[PDB]
C-alpha cells in the first residue's frame, strides 16, 4: 500500500532538520525588522 514509505520518512527527516534550521532564522529576521518598531518610544507635548 505504501511503496513510498521509506522515501517519505527520509524526506520527513530532512524536512524536520530543515525547518528546525529555518524557523529561528526567519524569526530572527522578523524580530530584526519588527524590533525597529518594538522599541519605539512615543511622547506627548500639549501646549496646555
Amino acid at each position: 500500500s505504501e511503496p513510498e514509505h521509506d522515501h517519505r520518512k527520509r524526506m520527513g527527516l530532512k524536512m524536520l532538520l530543515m525547518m528546525g534550521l529555518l524557523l529561528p532564522l526567519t524569526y530572527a529576521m522578523k524580530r530584526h525588522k519588527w524590533s525597529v518598531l518594538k522599541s519605539r518610544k512615543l511622547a506627548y507635548r500639549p501646549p496646555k
Binding site: 518610544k41 512615543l42 511622547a43 506627548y44 507635548r45 500639549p46 501646549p47 496646555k48
Partner: protein, 111 residues
C-alpha cells in the same frame, strides 16, 4: 547687521540688522515652556568597572572585585559564566522535576 554664524556651514554669512544683532523677539515676555509627558521613563546606568588579571596570590584583586557597588547578588556577580551555568542548572532541574511528575503519574497508572 554684517555676519551671523549660521547656514549649516559652521561659518559666518550675511544677515540683517534685525536678525544678526537682535536675535530675540520683540514680544513683551516669554510665554511658556510646556513639559513632555511619557508612558514610563527608562533607567539610565553606566558600566565601566570591567575586571583585572589572575595569577598567584591574586586574592585581593578579587576581594576588590567582589565589593558590590552594583545591586546584584553574588551568584550573578562574576558576570557571564556563572550566570549561564546557573541558567542551565535551573533549566535542567525544572525539566527533571516535570519529568518526575510525568514518571510518578505513569507509575501510578497500572497496565
Amino acid at each position: 547687521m554684517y555676519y551671523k554664524f549660521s547656514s549649516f556651514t559652521q561659518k559666518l554669512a550675511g544677515a540683517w540688522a534685525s536678525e544678526a544683532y537682535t536675535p530675540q523677539g520683540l514680544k513683551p515676555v516669554s510665554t511658556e515652556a510646556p513639559p513632555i509627558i511619557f508612558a514610563t521613563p527608562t533607567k539610565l546606568t553606566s558600566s565601566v568597572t570591567a575586571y583585572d588579571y589572575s595569577g598567584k596570590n591574586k586574592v585581593p584583586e578579587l576581594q576588590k572585585f567582589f565589593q558590590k557597588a552594583d545591586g546584584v547578588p553574588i551568584h550573578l556577580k562574576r558576570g557571564l559564566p556563572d550566570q549561564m551555568l546557573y541558567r542551565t542548572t535551573m533549566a535542567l532541574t525544572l525539566g527533571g522535576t516535570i519529568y518526575c511528575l510525568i514518571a510518578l503519574y505513569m507509575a501510578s497508572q497500572p497496565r
